[model samples]
Target chain A: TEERLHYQVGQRALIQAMQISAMPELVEAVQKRDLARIKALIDPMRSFSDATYITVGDASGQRLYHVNPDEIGKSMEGGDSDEALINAKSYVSVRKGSLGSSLRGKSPIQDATGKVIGIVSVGYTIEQL
Target chain B: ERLHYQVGQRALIQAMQISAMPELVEAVQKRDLARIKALIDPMRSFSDATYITVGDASGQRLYHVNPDEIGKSMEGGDSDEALINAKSYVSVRKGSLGSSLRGKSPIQDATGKVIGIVSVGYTI
Candidate 1:
């Protein structure tokens, strides 16, 4: 609701971020660097939301996916990634990025042994909203 | 320069024309390996390209005329511009398949989104 849009958007994206990060397919794709499989995974995800887009990054912070598309294989933009990739925290934050400032839901992607292997993010550029 | 440009020119023309195919544009974005093959297979006998390969946006080959090369990284290390910058050009480099003159072009879906690259190579 517009009444609490910030919280709603952030949490909505945050929830999806956790779900995407945990998928077996996603875990394998990131570990194997299977970008074709990763691209296929983004198809159904469009239903998650029109305004919110997702991104995935390896443990080293190289992007595997991004709503911006070209951002794929580049560094995860914005310094905000440290909280999620380093500390394994799942939380919401607002910061500028390659695509500009936006609120984002962020999470750590973990492997079967519970090792943090990557990062998953969902974000919305605020200006359009 | 003349020989290089002709080889590059021929390969580049084939690559750009192939990338523009609506059927191919759909398959690249969808990452449909079978669909990609159906389209590429027809070119085997007719194409002047010594070898033709297609890769998804991530640089993984979706189809290769050599068949065995499918589902692997494209041999040359020159895919960066075509994949990242959506540029179409020619390059010469050595890799798993040896040195060749290759034309690299970005594959964009009908929606104008970058999906992958289609490369046509002529053995040197």
Candidate 2:
């Protein structure tokens, strides 16, 4: 199936950056578009993990999804490095933001062929984390 | 400009627990009033918006709740609530209530009900 894709070892660690307390539910919320569920599930981790973030982007790395209450209706981008941008394109995490710095991870979402489709990454400032 | 991490985290946690945001977004898209009310109830305690009001599709004020002006009528008021129906999305308007710090989140029901809007005002 084209949907049963997995992340690379480095990218998997990016989940940690989000301080993801519930992995199974996070995956489920991402799939269901249950915005309320997504918000509810991520709440516990806000304090448990400081460097955590959840971002979603398409295959082209243009549109990124984020639940930043203040930053709604905007796009999130990975501009820290070429690799960070690559991660953003494919549901991976990177240790950088759009400024070519280090981010949380470099994971990607892919098709059955393992080709990249989207990315979800996190980067934190000390204040942010 | 540091986050009151403890208070903010607790408030956001509650917001998330009840699916406040996603439910609010879905409600606005569907025009559901009851759902908007349900989801917005918990947000009153922590957020900065001092007051929030909900209106009907025909611009009638359905419900208005705030610390200072509770149960007031917003009938025929030209607030931001007008924009949700025509656009089927959330619209934010600034410069209301003087130079106050307000964060407005549009509230709709899950059935695509653009019932009204909810906002938080920060006191200086």
Candidate 3:
């Protein structure tokens, strides 16, 4: 149990590092509302890992970017995205979904005014990093 | 292996920030290149995988673990991306050789103007 928790914590730090590391570019794309640019920025990331993926959500809990283009413009309500937006904080949770049991982190993306403008969610399967 | 790498990286970052960083900042402000070298050289004894380097705003090498590299342009390392636009943040990026996590901080003079960058990196 401890080792698994430790991996989760370390992986969370790695993911957050990757996020904050890319924040300047990600936020700039968000500001321009450049869907193609945002998609281009995130699309290449799919090669990192099949289980590790990024999804973007607006403050109102609508999906703005997703690996599956069809999911874009849909609502992410009742999921981790809404939890992060509603609380305006970051969180990690292990839940089951169509993909399988996974560990996910939901972090708020705030603008210059400190208002939560969007959510960036990343996930990895339980058996993987 | 991963745990050991993480621990080593964390240790290097801690030593750089908590130990020699203040002195480096003071030395840079005074434009004391000798003091900067003196402060950074001995740190090489810590670990072979961990080393400290400093660069000017234009990516000119100021003090490097390798004495021969002093005064050379560090642009070949491609570290200017983080150093030039630094806003007092730590960043990790992959270079030509390998992956490095850099704790990049700006060196400001008495007038609060940024003169250079102090960075610590550990190979991962």
Candidate 4:
């Protein structure tokens, strides 16, 4: 049976924990170009997400980099990787989409012209809407 | 829906057994190379009705051999790769692909690392 979603309190608690966790911190680390901090936090928890990533892309739909080290240098040019496309599209969305039962928050990285060029997002799962 | 959930549950159980194999579990928990080798060497068995297959997260097509292919990285093409990448945990994904494949169970190592996923198709 499909489990009923809990949105009111449980999700709030989880998002708060995520705020403290290394996921978003790592994203911030990238903004600062602090590779040392990124490596320190990601190395220990890489296996936890099976090395899942926060992918960045350019306005032209080209991937800049994946925060996950295992896939750092990969390109999404005409690739069949779903994550590549999905994550790339995510970078351009006006608002974050629903992470199934939860929700995602968006942070756009714009160019000097104020045109949205890149984005960063936090996806919350059913447990952390 | 009840039937579909049942299939997903059974697939999850089987996938768990494979993920917990003495060898596979060790590799995930302690980075045991020998154990990982042993785990991958033996082809574990599961219900035939299961919609198992093998591939990578890149959407490459190795072969839809069985339900277990959801775990293989032959090219990393399974849809669950995103969830695996995000949560780094074993997860189940329900599918609406036809009448057979109702859902899948992506298995993980003791450290909650997904190595394989098994999708079960109910016998209608």
Candidate 5:
């Protein structure tokens, strides 16, 4: 059924978000809380055709880079960050966010010492996908 | 559009996949030939593209089988849609390499600004 778009989009979000989080520049930016640097490094990485938006948020869940500049420094809209942030896991999730109901993947950003410092969330809104 | 046998379909898939590559996007944005070649060097051996060309925003050639053409401008004036409108499309056009079916995809940054283009063509 066309409903498979849910799983397909979810997996793509998870994989791409995980892939970008592996970039040293993004990890370093988040580790240093360098908001400007994070944007500069990640803005080029957000054009994947597999997902609608790629968001970077700090350990505290404050967004570091979001498609909407207004959402920067604000708390992430989705409430599914516990496992990814606390347990340092990478997984897919679905929930209604300020961007509307979407399927998203959350990946924890960790430093060299394996300390989780941030998260990369990729989403595909139903209408937007 | 008329069926172009194996050419059109394959070129479309290749162009889209290559355009979606983050490495290619970054390489084009950086105008880094080594990186662009690293990503593209394997295409001819692995696929059917007669020629795969990468162009910067101004349509300057970035990657070409004939290295001499590397810094020159792209032929075929059919790139305005992809470069200016950020479109991914297919068209049959006569280019310097000869008439072929080309798949053209725009490379855009996060701001949705068109930065470059990837064209995968198969001779027909």
Candidate 6:
């Protein structure tokens, strides 16, 4: 028997991406306020596969680590992705990607104290399924 | 879910077994840890949720993604113990991490002698 999902394979991939996007390490780094270590851990951890990659943002929805290096530290508040960080929840949506349409999974990153410090966003294509 | 899990498991093993390629096995036979490490560097970033590790029959870690663990005895549980002894196996277990599904394959030298084990694990 198979369990039907409210989300599809692409969305599952996105959520899996979010769950594995260095939450524990990022949380520890954030707690220590170690920017250099955060950057090192964040860089190589993204893009798990050819069709998958992740992004990081602050609670205010500012991009901390994006694929485009220049966009780091830029505000993403005006975007639809702000809900996950602002509300401390998980969010999924279809968005535009460099290749074409993409599915995004966004979730809040919380520290050991259970405080939401940032957001983790992952993107992948449905076509990969 | 079972199918998805199997697919991921297969992919992980296939990705890991690349380290046991003919050239890599030859390097392993030469006990050239540096060469073995270099050959597996590209596979290190293969997946964020999955990791590749290599160990001999006695559970002595030959190569690990974490540099600090090189040459240390693998702190593995039943599945790992079984794999190291039996030479090959696939198993799912709950460890310090969460539920993990791992596939283990033996690395054979040119003479088909089991010299080490290449293992990959995916957090499920």
Scored by lDDT, model 4 comes in at 0.36
Q: Rate the local accuracy (lDDT) of all candidates.
A: 0.75, 0.41, 0.58, 0.36, 0.77, 0.60
Write out the backbone clash pairs for model 3.
none
Please list, in the order the candidates appear, how each scores on TM-score for chain B only.
0.92, 0.39, 0.64, 0.41, 0.92, 0.74
lDDT of 2 by residue, A38-121 (tens): 556555344333334555544455433454665433455545324433542323334445434434544454444545554445
* Superior candidate under DockQ, 1 versus 3: 3
Q: List TM-score (chain A only) for every prediction.
A: 0.90, 0.49, 0.75, 0.33, 0.91, 0.70
* Model 2 segments more than 4 A misplaced: A1-124, A127-129, B1-22, B25-35, B66-100, B105-115
Candidate 1 residue-wise lDDT, A8-90, digit = tens: 56645665566556555678888898888877775445442444567789998998877777788789877888878888888
What does DockQ come to for candidate 6? 0.07
| Cα RMSDs, all models | 17.7, 14.7, 12.1, 17.1, 8.0, 10.9
lDDT of 3 by residue, B36-105 (tens): 7766664444223355667766667788767787787753354554455545434556643357665555
Candidate number of the best lDDT: 5
Please provide, for model 3 over A1-129, each residue's C-alpha lDDT reduced to its tens digit, 9 standing for 90 to 100.
Answer: 457455634454334423431344566677677788778656644432333556777778677787778888987633555656766666666676435666766777777677777777767666664
lDDT by residue for model 5 over B14-123, one digit each (tens)? 56656766667788778889988877775454454688899999999998889999999998789999999887778888888888889888888768898888898877
Model 6 alpha-carbon miss at residue B9, Å: 6.9
Query: What class would a CAPRI assessor give candidate 4's docking?
Result: incorrect
User: Please, what are the lDDT tens digits per residue for candidate 4 over residues A57-83?
Assistant: 443434444444555444432222233
In candidate 5, how many Å is residue B56 off? 18
Whichever of 1 and 5 has more lDDT, that candidate is 5
Pairs with backbone N, CA or C atoms under 3 Å apart (clashes), candidate 5: none
